[PDB]
Write a protein that binds this ligand. Structure first.
Ligand SMILES: COc1ccc(/N=c2/[nH]c(N)c(C(=O)c3ccc(OC)cc3)s2)cc1
Ligand SMILES: [Cl-]
Ligand SMILES: [Cl-]
Ligand SMILES: [Cl-]
Ligand SMILES: [Cl-]
Ligand SMILES: [Mg+2]
Ligand SMILES: [Mg+2]
Length: 298
């Protein structure tokens, strides 16, 4: 089908997706957009719930604008702001290490981004470099690290009672193993702490080039998650974060948060801004990838 909604032309498949993602164009405004498609026959629908989480988030810094949700042939479609490459794309472009300055510019932003999500009574639960995208130059947000992919989010404040969700265990594992928190591996209900811990793992991935549990395989997914969690538990923070004392402090702090506890986001930002200033860095958005040829759908 040629169109989604009144005004969005459906274009080519984009990204490296299987038809899940297309370029689109708002014919009414002469603007490109991203079109996410999900078959109506899906045995595990996620797109409509994702749209509802975007409505709960509302308009925010580093959150893509969402323009439409509705049918498109035999698909449900969500039309959203077209962003730039992901941090994983950019990491590859930068030979799979980022400088401390780039990691800190990312980290300072992403602590705030997670604070925003948490302020809207949601936990994110899908931290990975693929889900953080820079903007496009055309919208003056190419410097801003955005967060996408809210299909795995959850409301952590129950809306009627206004109580934090209860602690429980035996939660099935499905996420991304590489970044997930130790408590996620143990089958615990995720909470605010776990989003911040997964961010810490991702920051160390960027700094080191890899994480020491990244290569582990097993005959079953469950066994693989187990081995990865075992390695996370067996790798001292002082070792993982050798040469990055503030990252060690960050990770120890988030690992030690209680399930119900509100993180001190101010404290975590200050760890990193104090470090940033002490190193003489200037917060000028000159990330490692500036000056390189970025992948673009057009
Ligand atoms: C490297 O090629 C591309 C670079 C940037 C790009 N922009 C996007 N903007 C979005 N809002 C996107 C998404 O919502 C999205 C949707 C699905 C998806 O599946 C892996 C990945 C990203 S991709 C899409 C493709
Ligand atoms: Cl445009
Ligand atoms: Cl920010
Ligand atoms: Cl991995
Ligand atoms: Cl600098
Ligand atoms: Mg915006
Ligand atoms: Mg995903």
């Amino acid at each position: 089908v040629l169109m989604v909604g009144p005004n969005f032309r459906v274009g080519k498949k984009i990204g490296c997706n299987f038809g899940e993602l297309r370029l689109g164009k708002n014919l009414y405004t002469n603007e490109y957009v991203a079109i996410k498609l999900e078959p109506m026959k899906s045995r595990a629908p996620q797109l409509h719930l994702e749209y509802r989480f975007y409505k709960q988030l509302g308009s925010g810094d580093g959150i893509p604008q969402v323009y439409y949700f509705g049918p498109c042939g035999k698909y449900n479609a969500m039309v959203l702001e077209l962003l730039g490459p992901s941090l994983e794309d950019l990491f590859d472009l930068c030979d799979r290490t980022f400088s401390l300055k780039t990691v800190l510019m990312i980290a300072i932003q992403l602590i705030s981004r997670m604070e925003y999500v948490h302020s809207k009574n949601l936990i994110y639960r899908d931290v990975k470099p693929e889900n953080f995208l820079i903007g496009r130059p055309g919208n003056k947000t190419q410097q801003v690290i955005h967060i996408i992919d809210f299909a795995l989010a959850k409301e952590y404040i129950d809306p009627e009672t206004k109580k934090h969700i209860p602690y429980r265990e035996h939660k099935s594992l499905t996420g991304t193993a590489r970044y997930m928190s130790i408590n996620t591996h143990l089958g615990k209900e995720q909470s605010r702490r776990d989003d911040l811990e997964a961010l810490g793992h991702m920051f160390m991935y960027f700094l080191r080039g890899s994480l020491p549990w990244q290569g582990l395989k097993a005959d079953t997914l469950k066994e693989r998650y187990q081995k990865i969690g075992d390695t996370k538990r067996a790798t001292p923070i002082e070792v993982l974060c050798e040469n990055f004392p503030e990252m060690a402090t960050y990770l120890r702090y988030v690992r030690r948060l209680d399930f119900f506890e509100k993180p001190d986001y101010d404290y975590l930002r200050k760890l990193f801004t104090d470090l940033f200033d002490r190193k003489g860095y200037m917060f000028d958005y000159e990330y490692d990838w500036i000056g390189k040829q970025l992948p673009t759908p057009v």
